[PDB]
Amino acid sequence: ATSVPHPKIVKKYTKKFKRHHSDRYHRVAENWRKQKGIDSCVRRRFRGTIPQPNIGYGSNKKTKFLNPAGYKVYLVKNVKDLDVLLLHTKSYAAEIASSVSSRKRVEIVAKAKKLGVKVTNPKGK
């Protein structure tokens, strides 16, 4: 890891918690919703039903918010936004906003390279 050393990052659940019957119906979106029905097999946690979000799956507080490279990602919209990462170049990486123009994005990439800040999306436009 090129970042500040950390314990091995553990993700207790790596899949996506998908709402019940978002596979059965198009009108039911995958965005997680807790079943509230009286008879629900999922709300009652029958064997074979889907896993549900709960606080037990919470991430280790020491590896939380770190991408696989070990950085915390901070959203940057202009070159002056990189100033808050001057003393955190080994623990925070910059991500250039999607609505930044191709010109200002070139300026942000050039200044980030000058400052040693890592950029999570260094290619797009």
Nearest approach in angstroms of CB 5 to RNA is 17
Return the structure tokens found at 73.
Answer: 């990602």
What is the rounded distance in angstroms from the CA atom of residue 47 to the CA atom of residue 112?
A: 51
Shortest separation between residue 116's beta carbon and RNA, angstroms: 20
Other beta carbons within 10 angstroms of residue 73's beta carbon come to: 16
Nearer to RNA, 47 or 123 (CB): 123
Q: Does 33 bind RNA (CB under 7 A)?
A: yes
Residues 67-96 interacting with RNA (rule: CB under 7 A): 67-68, 73, 75, 95-96
Query: Looking at 2, 7, 24, 48, which residue binds RNA (CB under 7 A)?
Result: 24
Residue 117, judged by CB atoms within 10 A of its CB (0-12, 13-18, 19+), counts as: buried
Burial class from Cβ neighbours inside 10 Å (0-12, 13-18, 19+) for residue 42 reads middle
Which chain residues interact with RNA by CB under 7 A?
A: 9, 11-13, 16-17, 20-21, 24-25, 27-29, 31-33, 37, 53-55, 57-59, 63-68, 73, 75, 95-99, 120-121, 123-125
